[PDB]
Structure formats: C-alpha cells, structure tokens
Design a protein around this nucleic acid. Sequence first.
DNA 1: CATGAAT
DNA 2: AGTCATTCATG
DNA 3: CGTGCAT
DNA 4: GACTATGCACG
Lengths: 208, 207, 482, 482
Amino acid sequence: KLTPAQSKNPAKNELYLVEGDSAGGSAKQGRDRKFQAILPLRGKVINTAKAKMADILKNEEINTMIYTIGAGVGADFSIEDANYDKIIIMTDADTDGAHIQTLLLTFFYRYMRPLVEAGHVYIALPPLYKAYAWTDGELEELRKLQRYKGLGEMNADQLWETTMNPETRTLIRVTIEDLARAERRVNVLMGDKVEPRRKWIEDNVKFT
Amino acid sequence: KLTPAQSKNPAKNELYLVEGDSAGGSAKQGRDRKFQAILPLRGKVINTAKAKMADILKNEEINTMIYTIGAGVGADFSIEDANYDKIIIMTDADTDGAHIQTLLLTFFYRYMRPLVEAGHVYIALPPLYKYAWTDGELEELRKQQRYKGLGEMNADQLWETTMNPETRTLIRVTIEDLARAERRVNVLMGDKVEPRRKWIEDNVKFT
Amino acid sequence: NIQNMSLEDIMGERFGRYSKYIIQDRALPDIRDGLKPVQRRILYSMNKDSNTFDKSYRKSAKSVGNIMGNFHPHGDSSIYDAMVRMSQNWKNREILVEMHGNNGSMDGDPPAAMRYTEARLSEIAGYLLQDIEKKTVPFAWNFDDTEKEPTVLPAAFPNLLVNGSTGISAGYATDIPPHNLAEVIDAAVYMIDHPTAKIDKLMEFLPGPDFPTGAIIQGRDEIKKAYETGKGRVVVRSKTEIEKLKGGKEQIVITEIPYEINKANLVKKIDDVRVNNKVAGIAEVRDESDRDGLRIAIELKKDANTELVLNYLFKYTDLQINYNFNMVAIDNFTPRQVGIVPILSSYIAHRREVILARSRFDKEKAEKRLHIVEGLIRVISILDEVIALIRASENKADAKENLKVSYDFTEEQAEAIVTLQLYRLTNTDVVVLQEEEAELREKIAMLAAIIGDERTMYNLMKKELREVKKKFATPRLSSLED
Amino acid sequence: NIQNMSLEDIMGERFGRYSKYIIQDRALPDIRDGLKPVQRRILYSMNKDSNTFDKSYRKSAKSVGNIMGNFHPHGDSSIYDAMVRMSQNWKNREILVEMHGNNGSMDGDPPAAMRYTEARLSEIAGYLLQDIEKKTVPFAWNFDDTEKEPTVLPAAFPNLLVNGSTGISAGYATDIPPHNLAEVIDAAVYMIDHPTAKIDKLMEFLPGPDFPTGAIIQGRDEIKKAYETGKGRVVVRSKTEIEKLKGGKEQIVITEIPYEINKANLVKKIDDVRVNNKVAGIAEVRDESDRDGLRIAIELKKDANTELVLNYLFKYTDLQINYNFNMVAIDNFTPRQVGIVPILSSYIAHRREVILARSRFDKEKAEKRLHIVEGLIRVISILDEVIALIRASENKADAKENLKVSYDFTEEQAEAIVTLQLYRLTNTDVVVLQEEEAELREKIAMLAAIIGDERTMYNLMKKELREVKKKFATPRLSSLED
DNA sequence: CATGAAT
DNA sequence: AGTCATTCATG
DNA sequence: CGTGCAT
DNA sequence: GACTATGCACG
Ligand SMILES: N[C@@H]1[C@H]2CN(c3nc4c(cc3F)c(=O)c(C(=O)O)cn4-c3ccc(F)cc3F)C[C@@H]12
Ligand SMILES: N[C@@H]1[C@H]2CN(c3nc4c(cc3F)c(=O)c(C(=O)O)cn4-c3ccc(F)cc3F)C[C@@H]12
Ligand SMILES: [Mg+2]
Ligand SMILES: [Mg+2]
Ligand SMILES: [Mg+2]
Ligand SMILES: [Mg+2]
Ligand SMILES: [Mg+2]
Ligand SMILES: [Mg+2]
C-alpha cells in the first residue's frame, strides 16, 4: 500500500496517513517524493479501545502502520528506531474525516504514546474554500466560491500548495497536555461503555 | 458459484449457463429448484481455438464447467456419467450475448464433442419485446419495453418466458455436417486473422 | 506554520462534530416523515425528475448519479443500497420504490448492480411527497448552495410507524418495527379527536407491530410497555404447521419467518442442527420456497419427538427471536426516545403545519388571480379609454404608471392589462369572467376558514387520512398473541 | 417445444452479429469526427446537459448516469473510463474533457472513482459540437426510442488526425497517432484549394505525428508510406541530456518519453538493466518527475561509457520503441484502411454537408422573421385602423380573417400581429424595424450565396478553419528526423 | 452475531 | 461486477 | 506483452 | 472503492 520516500531519513521524512486510495493518489502526485511518503488507509480504522488485542493484532491497516512506522508496538517500542520525524494524518474536511482522525489518535495514544508525547504526530489542515480560505473569516477578505467536499476535489498541484508543502501549509501538532485529563476523554469517547458517552454528548453537543 | 438443483437426476436436471452474476441471481430466483441448476459465467469466455491448452486448463470458468457437468474433458469424456440432460446457454439477447454463445459453443465442440453431438446443448431464446420474440409478433400484440438484457426482467418474468419447460423455446444445436462445421468454427475462432477478415467481408452486409 | 492543540481538545472538536452529524443527519429518522436524510433525498430527487409510479421506469444509475450530484454528497453504492432497500417488500411494510429486476431475495443474495436495474417511486411514495410544490415544508440549501432541498416531507401518511426504521448512530440506536397502515391511521384519527388519549385506548386501534414477513408476535405487555416508553422486548415466532407423511413420519412446515431474518442462513443453521445431531430426530431439511410461496419442510424420523425438536429450534435458531423496540427519532433537531403518543402527536402537529401552509399557498394563488380578474372586468367597461391611454404612453412602464394614476389599477393589474395580447381586445363578455370571480371567491372562503378555524382544519386532516386508508389499506400479516 | 439449428448456421449468425456491431459501433472511429460511439455520446450528453467549459464542474457520476440512461446501454465503468481518457493530456493531443481531481497519471496509477471526480467539456470539444442545434447532422433514435442522438458530430476541426485513435475490433484494428492541430488544418485548407493534391505536397503542411508526450520521431520514408496506405512503422525515441556531476561522474536525464508508454514500468525495466548488469556503468535510477516536470535521472558510475549505456537502453528498453500506423476508420458504414487523402477528403465532404445544412437552417429563420418584420412595418402606418379592425372582430380567428381580407396580410403575419402584447402599441418605431429588415436581407443574401455556389461555401470552410487554428494553435511537441 | 448507512 | 473490513448500539 | 472498449 | 480474467488485432 505504501509509497515510500526516495531517500531514507528519520530527521526529515514525513509519513502521510491519507483517508482513501483516491485521495492517496492525489497525494502521490502532489507530494515532494524526496522525503514524503504516502500510505492510504482503506476504510474506517479499527477502534483500538473497543476491540480485543487479538483482533487488533490481526488488522491489516494496523499491522502495516506498525510495519511502515518501524518502531514495533506496545511496550516493545523504540522511538529511536522509527522511520519518520513527522507522522501526518490527512483526512477529508468532513465529519467522517473527523471520525477517522479520532480513531487513529486513540491508536497512537494507546499503543505508541512516546510518538505522541514527543510532538511527532500532526494533522494536516486542508482548506475549506476556494485565493484559498480556511473558515468564514478568510472568505470575507477574499470577497473583497467553490466549497471543498473532500481531498478528492483538489487537483494535485493545489494539494501541494495548500496542505503538503512545508513552506505553505498548516499542521496541528498533537500534544498530551494532561495525561490524566486525556486518558478519561479517550476512554469516555472511545470506550466499551455507552452510557457515559451518551451523557458526554448530551452535555457537550449543541443541537440547537 | 454453482447453485445446485435440489435432487440429482442425470435424466431431468438442466444446467443453465447464465451470462453474469446479476442474471444468475434473477435466474436463481426464477428457476424450479427441483431440477434446474444455475451456473453464472463471470466475463467473456476464453477462446478455446486461439489460446494454448495450458492457459486453458488453468482458466477458472472452464475448470468449474468440466467439473459441474462432471464427465471430464475431451478424449477422456464419458457422456454416460454426465449430470445433466440439458445444458442451456442463456445470454442477454445483445451482441455481446451472441459473442458468448460463440465462445462457449466452440468449447463444447472442441472439448466435449459427444455432448453437442447427442443434441444435449441448447440455447435459450429470451424475448425481445414486452410478450413477443419476433418484430412480427410485435405489431400483432399492438392490435390486441424493449429488453436490452436479462437483468431487465423480474424473476417471475424470467421463468414464465424462458425457463419454464412448458412455456419456453430452445434452439437445439445439432451438428448437421461434420466437415462444413469444422471449417466454420475455424475461419471464425482460430489464430489466422486474414480468413476471418475475408469471411466478414463476404457475409456481413454493412448496408 | 504549525499549531498546537491538546489531545483533550482535538478529540473533542472531532468526536463532537461526527457525533452530531451521525445523529441528526445519518442514522436516525425524523419523527414526522419517518425518513433518514438519504431516503428523503432519494424520494425528492426521483420526484423532481418525474420518475413516478405512473411513468416509465428509469435506469437506477441515472437516478443515483442525480441524487449524488445534486443532494447527497456520499458514495453511489450506499445511495443505491438504500434505494434498493426501499423496494424490498420483505423489509418495508409499504415499499416506496418500485424496482424492476433483481433487487435481492429473502435469501439475501446481492441485488443486481445499478447498471442493471430500473426504478421509480411507488404510488404510496407519491403521498409522502404530496403537496411539496406548495411551499408546505421547509427547504435548505444543498451541499452545493446550488439548489434547495426539503428538510422534511409533507407525509400524507405516518411513515415512521408504517415502515419503521433502524437504527445505529453514536450514543444512540433505533429500532421501530413496521405497522399496518390502516391501524396507524385509525389511531391518528382517534387522537385528532381525543388529543389526551391514553395508550390502553389507542391500542384498540393499534394493537401492535405488523411485519411484512408476517409471523406471530407474542407479548401484549411488552408491547404496551414499548408504546408507553419506547423500549420493550417482544417475541416473534415462525408460523408453523405439522404434516403427517407416510409411515409414522411427521414433517414440520414453515410458512412465515421473523422480520429481519435471512431465510438461507436460517435454513442452513437448522440443517446444522441435523448434521451435528445437537438434538435427535431430524431426517432432512428442505427449502421449498418458489417464486410464489415460502415453504421450509423439516422432515422428522419415524418415532421422533416433534415437540422437543420444534422447541429446540425455537430456542437455538432464529426460527424464533426476540425483537427489541428502541424507538428513537429526531424531534426538534435532537434525538428523543419516544412512545406511540409523542409519535402520533408529532405527526398531527406536522400535518397541521402542512395543511395550513398548503392552504395559505392555494389561497395566495386564488387571490392574485381574483385580483387580476377584477381589473379585467373593469377594463372592459373602459376599453376605448384604456387603449387610448396605452396608445399615448411612451412605453410599458409609462403605460402602467398611466393606468395606476388615471384609472386606479394596482401594479399587478396594470402589468396584466399591459401584457394582454391584441386579440383579447375582441372580447366583451363580462359574464364568463364573473363566473371565475365567483368560483375564486368561494375557494378563498373555504381556504380562509381552514386557516382560521382549528376544527374545520382538523376535519380536513381526518378526511384526508381516511381517503389514504381506504386506498392503501391491506390486511394484517402478523398475528398477535398474549 | 423447441427449434433445431445447425452448428454451422448458428455460429455463423451469432458471430456475424458481434462482428458487425463491434466494427461499426464499438471499436473503430468514424472517419469524419474521429469519435468512437461511446466518445460521441459522452460529448453529446454532457453538452445537452449544459456541462461546458464555461460553466461549473459537474460530478462525474451524474454525467455518467445520464449517458448510460439516455444513450449508451453499457457498464458505467466503461463509460467512466472512456470519459477519464478523454481528459488525459498524455493520451490526447487536444483534451475533450476537463476533469478536476485524480484522473490518472503517466505512471498508470488508477484515476479516482467516479464518485470523487468532477468534469465538463473542454472549450475545444465545444467546436466539435458547434451547430448541432441547427439540423446539420443525421440523428437516430436511441435504444429507448425516447430520444434522438447524433450518428456523427458537426466537427469544426479534423479530430480523427488531431487526437488519433486505437483501436481493436473483429477482423480489423486501428492505430492512428495524434497530430498538431495547426498542421492538420493547414493541410486541409490546402486540399480544399487543390482537391487532387498528392502526399508529397501535403507533407509540407503535415510533416507527421505530434505526440502529447513529445519526443523524437525518426522516419520520413515510413511516414510517407503510412500517409499513403494507412500502414507504416516509424521510430520513437526519448528526449535526453547529459548532466555533469561532481567527481567525474555523469548523468543521463530523460525529459520526454514515447507515446503510450507507462513511465513507471519504463523506470523498473531500466532499473532491471542495472540490477542485472546487462550493460556496465549504471549507478542508480531515480524518477524525479514532479507535478510540474517529467524527469528520469540515470546516474552513471565514475569511469563509465555513457554512450555504451545510452545506446543499450534505447535498444533493449522502451526508451525507444516502434510505432505502427494502422489507420482504419468507418467510412460509409464500413471499415476502411486509409491514408491522409481519404481522411482529409472525407472530412471536407462532411464539413460541406454541415455548412450547407447550417446555412439552409439559418436562411429559413431569417426569411420567416423578415416576413414578420415586413408586416409590422406595414402595420405601423395603419395602427389605429388595425386596432379598430380588431376591436370590431368577434375573436382571434375572426381578427385574422379580417386582417387578411382587408389589408392582405398573410396568415403568418396576422398571427404575429394579433398576438402582440398591448404595450407594443407604445413601441411605434419604423426606422428600427427597417434596420432589422436591411440586416436580414443582407444575411439572407450571404446565405443564399453559400447555398448556391460551391466555391463561396469552400471559402467559408477555409475561413472557419483558420479561425480555429488561430484560436487553438499550439507548437509542435514531437521533433522530426529522417 | 447481525443490522444499515457510512468510509 | 461480486468480495473484502471496519464504526456505531444493542441483546 | 499491452493497448481500449466490452463482458 | 481497488482487484481480478477474458475477447479482439497487431509487432
Ligand atoms: N481493509 C478493508 C478495505 C476496504 N474493504 C471495503 N471497502 C469498501 C467497501 C467494502 C469493503 F469490504 C464498500 O462496500 C464500499 C462502498 O462504498 O460500498 C467502499 N469501500 C471502501 C474501499 C476502500 C476505501 F479506501 C474506502 C472504502 F470506504 C475491504 C478492505
Ligand atoms: N473470471 C473473471 C471474473 C470477472 N473479472 C472481472 N470482471 C469485470 C471487470 C474486471 C474483472 F477482472 C471489470 O472491470 C468490469 C467492468 O465493468 O468494468 C466488469 N467485470 C465483470 C464482472 C463480473 C461479470 F460477471 C462480468 C464482468 F464483465 C475477473 C474474474
Ligand atoms: Mg468524504
Ligand atoms: Mg448486455
Ligand atoms: Mg458497500
Ligand atoms: Mg431463537
Ligand atoms: Mg472494467
Ligand atoms: Mg526499445
């Protein structure tokens, strides 16, 4: 599945986790091949906080990530034997992209904490509108209007200029701020038990 | 892939070779399970006159037929221990439908001659108009939906018109002249392109 | 260049987003028309495209592409799967899509691909859309901001109960079984008349679920509980008959099975009992269902305890299952676990909304027209002076201005007078127009009364529900037992 | 009951069917517009649906479903694949479809599924359809008998040669390479003036193929032969350059490769040469092409014979290949091996029919209008008497009779007068109508002349062809060597 | 284990 | 043109 | 082998 | 939403 970077280089090499084979194509074409690898996730990642470690080990998407990351998993995990400096999650700017980011984060938290605690995990911010804009704010100034439904809609030359180019792009760098206040959240949003999740939703989500 | 008939009976059981999974389903639904079995052909069938006998034995469509018909192949072929009394070819009544018949027919000819020679290989005639098969029968029902393929009909529709042994019609392939047929299959299906090109130029009127 | 968010915050703004959407706009039906958003778009697009029960079938792929491009920004395969589902009459008590071709079987073999099938709205589906062109229901912008789409349908019948729904989002799931159209309408009518009606009384009209697959439903109590609270666990059991065969051998024959149960898998699992000899007695298992009948024959050996066997299959196969009510729906943009009462009342409130809207709309047309007709009648009185005035006007605008100012026409009337074709000048019959004026005045009075009087309005809604019942009523398929 | 039939006879009938259809209506292009039937239907459909270069991208699945439901009764995937190809500028010299999103690549990696991509006609495809609304080309019923489709397009440029084709049916096959739009047009313009032109003279205008992929074409002689007989074998060789590197090492860089050659496979096959050490001196192969430039770097070892390596690569890989012209097309319903002259002439014949048809259609609109305008100019002088004459008539038909009988207007003029809106009586301007009359008389004279004089018409063809060249001309990409 | 809209 | 795996709640 | 409309 | 095999002519 993996399209690797030309030269192996832990200090600079980037690993793009892309939501979909089609978008993973736009990424191969759009990328700088020298230090940027592409790895398409085909379908929703397995919730690593709900399934049995048995079935989690037998997951193809999960296995190739441990393999392409090259640090092994669990407690048998050396961050010094990794293959990338930055691991970038790049999903559509839609609700299912949101979900997919959520499912990968809980994996990188429960099974590769060091990677997350070293500020090595990021999340691409694709644009929402096209001059390009992210959010209502930047549209008002551009007025002085195509709405992106997914990475699928961007030509490979736009993809680079807007979200893959280190010089032109924005990344959220994930950081564990409080290990305790963070364990609860993953466990409540992604855990086996429904009742607490349902409540959390009732209390936080504004249906209007 | 094969959908068996309920009971086994080399004397009554029929084998429908449907073009496509989807029509194989309409046919699974429409059939009479007690004696009609279904075997869907996925994709165009391998030209057994053009390709090497090795690539042939290795072809999944071919192998599964040799087995379900169940009498071996070619020179080790015993009509006696076959499973069906009627092998029925059922394709869309479109041009790719005709092609598939062609391909299959030259396989039964080449590798199971005894089966085609005993008049055990039929072709099912699905209707073209909605019921009437011949344009002629058409104008006659207007006195009293142009079907582009099998997938267009419902299961009750399939059975009534083409699968029900009472209400259907079947082109039964008999080999009339052994010599004049061997030549016809070859010009049309064999390696050499020139003769085929010539045959077309002679017989096909591009009006 | 780079921006820090906490794992805490990142997992919030994300799961919040997904959660909200899955609840409002994916898995759960709207309480009023009983549709999830994908089904609404399918019915609305097909209907926009004139693809109705009374016109030729249209290729599925064409319907699906139009839905995808105009309304529902998701996979073509999911849209199609949903379209197909609404056509399967062993999954929907009243099918909304009519599909020519292989749309599947109870054996759960795959529907022909969309390239192979054709479809159209069913006649009843029509009634779900009834009056949509009359500004009766709220519209939003589609994902493209290119076209408006309805947020709910007018629903001339109570689809939520009739067809049911199911039912898995985040924090919530839904299971609502289908019901008999006639029974549901009877309840709604009684409730229009008696808003404060209790469940016990409603149940003389709506005694319980009615599966398209028929069978036996057991547990009046749990039914009452579900209609009351929205949750409940009832038993659904296959319709069975015994058949004596030659030589002391008996044979169990199944003619109806439980909703949402796959026939091929059931039959296999029953045969697994025979192969494993989990229980002694089974001779052979035969699926004998044809294009016009469902028939599973379980032949037993001579001197075999046919009570024990049938009882074992009931417990260890899906010959009998539990069915769990978990009636959740979207009310006022939020998920609600609801019983029969909120459901019927939300429905009634909705029809009221529609009928009022429908009537304001028809009344507005009748008015604009009557207004023009009044002017035309007047104009005939002063034709020559009006032609002279137009003849003296510099242009269309000036002519209208002159009509307003000199003879007191309104803009709307002026515009109608000025865009008359010359030949109209030949007419001088006021009578025919006066007949139209009378017909319109009557129509407006009726319509005005519906809008001004709650009871006149609720009569209308009862009158219409009864027309629907008389037309689409079919008998119960599922038997009830306590 | 059944019906016996010989094997000889059955195989004959059946294969005759597939043969004919595959030849006329699947595998081979029409000699006039250069399209296979699927390509025509994609364009006709997209254009009917207003999906043009100047308007928003429409989601591919919507384009495909409409094509499949109205014109092409085949798999959606085939339709999509064809549509995709027309948009690839490495297979088409002048792309006919513009696609937004992953539409494939020179590495032959798969295009995004039709649910992800958007498309529309290119501006030039516009010119293939120009005048289709003007009754200029023969229409046939579609498989539905619901809609007419065009059997050929009006082709305002010689698409057969410009974009090429390929090409596999029954008994015949086709390979025609792309060509430079200007050159093709220069040739055709010459041939319009000199119908009996020989290949040698044509080749001063059209020296040979121009691949989208560029590169070097070797073989003036075989080109002549191909242009004469439809068959020929030319050589196609990659564009190269040597870069000096530090430490006395050199580097072969490839910047253009041969038509229909998968870049990814080429790079593996070359790297196989190195891995296998089939020729000494290759240090490393790298593909360095990115979104704005193709580039293959073959870094050589220190003391390496860069000629030995370059030559070997050309011979034993696809850095250099043979291209075989096998120009077959459908001409008068039948397949024909053809050179430049039959092609160009067939095109010219087609444009003639198209321009004559166009001109007849516009003339008739202009006469019908001229006739109306003549009556209106008359009506002005008798405005009052006409209004009175209408006021005095009992209805529409009567008003017309009176207009005919009393002022000798024709039916068609009476119809137009009588159906004027009142406000027109304020627009009482004869000079503006006389300008329109004059403009129409002139237009009608020009179109009469086109219709009545072959040379005047051929000049229109040349004039129009030059406008297309001025508008779409681009430089050669492929260089020629003999 | 399935269910049915989603990737 | 069928087929493979995952989410989410639920018993 | 590999091309492009087909199944 | 990618993958898998064929036909057909041709070097
Ligand atoms: N590790 C798992 C990959 C994907 N699997 C399936 N994918 C399906 C589907 C079914 C699958 F088994 C679909 O049914 C589907 C659709 O839209 O209907 C899309 N997809 C789908 C396929 C690829 C992808 F990237 C995203 C998708 F949503 C199998 C192995
Ligand atoms: N024995 C052969 C089966 C089918 N294979 C492929 N089938 C494809 C396709 C590709 C295949 F490998 C297609 O690409 C396709 C289409 O319409 O695009 C249809 N089909 C297709 C699939 C099933 C069928 F019955 C007919 C078809 F044309 C591989 C093995
Ligand atoms: Mg998306
Ligand atoms: Mg067909
Ligand atoms: Mg799917
Ligand atoms: Mg049970
Ligand atoms: Mg395909
Ligand atoms: Mg070579």
